[PDB]
Design a protein around this ligand. Structure first.
Ligand code: HEC
Ligand code: HEC
Lengths: 127, 127
């Protein structure tokens, strides 16, 4: 869907920006600093689930650019493992949110965050 | 979920960027220049549906900025009518996509596009 590589870059950066907001806005809830409304969080994690599937298709071959490391394309199977693992961590968060289980939510949230960081450590250039 | 107005601006611009991609990538399909796979389009319009609900919450009061016109906030009921109407046009597109009906899809796509433009004409500053 991208006329030039720059369009892919813009897409993925936007997708990741939205993910970051949908993930990060729950931080006060998991910390107890904001109240836990099970329905609010269920709906939000549904949005996060949708969004968390989107960036990967915008790292198609030849879409080098932005702060993407070239290892994304050298190493296809390893990058795919990291995104698929990340999406599976999102599944655990969805399960927690759907159950209305705050303890499972906290645990899953931590694991998701670790997965974001593991990918960045391997595949995102320093700012 | 926004620490400063700039964060709201960044969010909505990203949401609208993703909408534009999910909408616009169907143009060749509705024109017949690319093949119509009913399942592909159904899935894509589901993503568009999710995305099309997101920008509006990021025009909360005091989040002036970007290319948003101030009339968004003077005139709340009129802006809300335009976004809700737009989302209802997305419902028609969803119905068409879910039915696998290409003629309804074409018609709905046109109406959606007109709705994007009607909002821009009233509420988005010139580049
Ligand atoms: C690889 C499997 C990743 C996972 C999982 C997550 N992120 Fe990431 N992120 C990744 C890359 C390769 C990049 C660079 C993209 C580019 O082309 O520049 C990013 C970037 C971000 C950004 C910055 C986006 C921008 O505005 O330019 C953000 C805010 C971000 N990532 C957040 C984020 C969060 C919160 C994640 C888990 C919920 C997450 N990322 C996972 C690669 C990967
Ligand atoms: C009002 C009810 C709108 C509807 C419906 C649509 N758009 Fe829009 N758009 C609107 C505003 C007020 C702005 C400015 C946002 C800001 O703070 O700057 C925009 C902007 C866009 C953009 C640019 C985003 C960016 O990268 O800065 C795009 C690509 C865009 N809009 C596309 C778009 C499409 C394709 C729409 C229908 C499917 C659509 N918009 C509807 C207001 C409104």
């Amino acid at each position: 869907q991208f006329a030039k590589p720059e369009d892919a870059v813009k897409y993925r950066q936007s997708a990741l920006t939205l993910m970051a907001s949908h993930f990060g806005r729950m931080t006060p809830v998991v910390k107890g600093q904001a109240p836990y409304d099970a329905a609010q969080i269920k709906a939000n994690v549904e949005v996060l689930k949708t969004l968390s599937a989107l960036p990967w298709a915008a790292f198609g071959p030849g879409t080098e650019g932005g702060d993407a490391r070239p290892e994304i394309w050298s190493d296809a199977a390893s990058f795919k493992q990291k995104q698929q693992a990340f999406q599976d961590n999102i599944v655990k968060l969805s399960a927690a949110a759907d159950a209305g289980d705050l303890d499972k939510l906290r645990a899953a949230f931590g694991d998701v965050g670790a997965s974001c960081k593991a990918c960045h450590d391997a595949y995102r250039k320093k700012k």
